[PDB]
Design a protein around this ligand. Structure first.
Ligand code: HEM
Ligand SMILES: OCc1ccccc1
Ligand SMILES: OCc1ccccc1
Length: 432
């Protein structure tokens, strides 16, 4: 019934606690074993129930009428992405009393969430992504040719893994190649709001609300760019994802307000490539640690989807979203009160020993691989089938060219409690 111990709560809640995966995953493990559903009360944050168990993540996510993303009828009364209190106070000054800074899926509750998701639902289904496989494969091949020409010594992240998923999503989206560097810079600003190596020059870096200022500044740069793209596709439609979203109309034949298109476009321009790059880099890191796995998948390319699934489980680069209890609710002997916020810890769910035998082991032979790296419930990752296709296609093209991966310098993680993974993986490759 007590609060979570401060040292454990701080390790998970504070962005600084994610700088090193070792103490972070030991804090998740301490909770799952000792206090699987407790309230973290960290100075400068709202109290948060830390949802550490696989079964609890599904129980919460499958009941959106109880556990809201955006606050329910009081729209924008909950921030789905954990800011500190000072940050949420900054946002309420910016927006005038609420926290809905984007009109994007994570901020929405049903039935609004369903109406908006219906715009892109079919586009993201596996059968509808098949039309892109050959173009993704040509992109993967172009990226691997540059890797082979560049020699065996590189940062597998900033000199390889980042470019492929960015080129794929910008090509599908319909953004020209020359705009990719600025999209990459803004994605770094967006997911780097609390990382001292990713600070924007235009906001206060050390203010209590610094991360919320960076988030808003980054969004404003996206809105400027996307407003031009929305008016462009409304005036002259193309066969691209920018058009599908730009021209989308409601049941009354009115365009959705432009901010809905901007919200899609922000999610696509950031989430649409960064986590794909992280998972690919974490895959290479695991192949360095488990060379027998690389030998096996080179011997049987049909194992590549299993390798992708186990990489998603181990890397789990999307660490949380938040929810708010719309009513009192009992779970695992604890009384969650109406108004209480919850932090869904997907990386912890993915190490739950009740679900996964030897959960810290890299084992591609888990079948089925029950991972929750894409979440659950109506907010389950809409991009997951695009991500899995890109990772499958890259590893089908790449792994024949790799005899060995060696990590030849210190890996670096993005310092974030939100969307993380490797920003640096110095390697020495042996080409086949
Ligand atoms: C390895 C790659 C990816 C991983 C691990 C990942 C993971 C996640 C997770 C855990 C969520 C939250 C689910 C929940 O709240 O229960 C999510 C949401 C989302 N993801 Fe992904 N994601 C990935 C790739 C993508 C891609 C490629 C796109 C777009 C092209 C994308 C777009 C989204 C969107 C728009 C949401 C919000 C959905 C909603 O709230 O309804 N993601 N992702
Ligand atoms: O895939 C995670 C994500 C989705 C939308 C916006 C930010 C991050
Ligand atoms: O809810 C996950 C999902 C993914 C792709 C298309 C539709 C829905």
């Amino acid at each position: 019934t007590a609060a979570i111990p401060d040292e454990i709560a701080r390790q998970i809640v504070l962005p600084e606690g994610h700088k090193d995966n070792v103490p972070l995953f030991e804090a998740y493990r301490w909770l799952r074993e000792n206090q699987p559903l407790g309230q973290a009360r960290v100075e400068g944050y709202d109290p948060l129930w830390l949802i550490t168990k696989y079964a609890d993540l599904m129980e919460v996510e499958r009941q959106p009428q109880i556990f809201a993303a955006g606050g329910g009828e009081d729209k924008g009364s909950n921030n789905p992405i954990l800011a500190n209190q000072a940050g949420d106070e900054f946002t309420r000054q910016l927006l005038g009393g609420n926290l809905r800074i984007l009109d994007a899926l994570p901020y929405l509750d049903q039935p609004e969430h369903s109406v908006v998701k219906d715009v892109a639902f079919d586009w993201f289904r596996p059968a509808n992504l098949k039309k892109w496989e050959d173009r993704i494969r040509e992109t993967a091949r172009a990226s691997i040719d540059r890797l082979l020409a560049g020699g065996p010594d590189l940062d597998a992240v900033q000199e390889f893994a980042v470019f492929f998923p960015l080129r794929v999503i910008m090509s599908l989206f319909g953004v020209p190649e020359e705009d990719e560097p600025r999209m990459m810079a803004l994605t770094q600003d967006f997911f780097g709001v609390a990382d001292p190596d990713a600070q924007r020059d235009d906001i206060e870096a050390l203010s209590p609300d610094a991360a919320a200022q960076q988030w808003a500044a980054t969004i404003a740069d996206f809105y400027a760019y996307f407003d031009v793209l929305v008016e462009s596709r409304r005036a002259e439609p193309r066969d691209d994802l920018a058009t599908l979203i730009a021209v989308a109309k409601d049941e009354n034949g009115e365009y959705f307000p432009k901010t809905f298109a901007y919200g899609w476009f922000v999610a696509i321009a950031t989430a649409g490539h960064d986590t794909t790059a992280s998972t690919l880099a974490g895959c290479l890191q695991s192949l360095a640690a488990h060379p027998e796995v690389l030998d096996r998948v080179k011997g049987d390319p049909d194992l590549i989807p299993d390798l992708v699934n186990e990489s998603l489980r181990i890397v789990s680069p999307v660490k949380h979203f938040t929810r708010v209890a719309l009513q009192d609710y009992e779970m695992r002997g604890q009384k969650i009160k109406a108004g209480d916020r919850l932090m869904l810890l997907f990386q912890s769910g993915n190490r739950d020993a009740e679900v996964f035998d030897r959960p810290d082991d890299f084992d591609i032979d888990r079948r089925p691989n029950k991972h929750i790296a894409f979440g659950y419930g109506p907010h389950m990752c809409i991009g997951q089938h695009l991500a899995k296709l890109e990772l499958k296609v890259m590893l089908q093209e790449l792994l024949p060219h790799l005899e060995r991966v060696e990590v030849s310098g210190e890996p670096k993680l993005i310092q974030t409690n939100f969307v993380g993974g490797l920003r640096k993986l110095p390697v020495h490759l042996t080409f086949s």
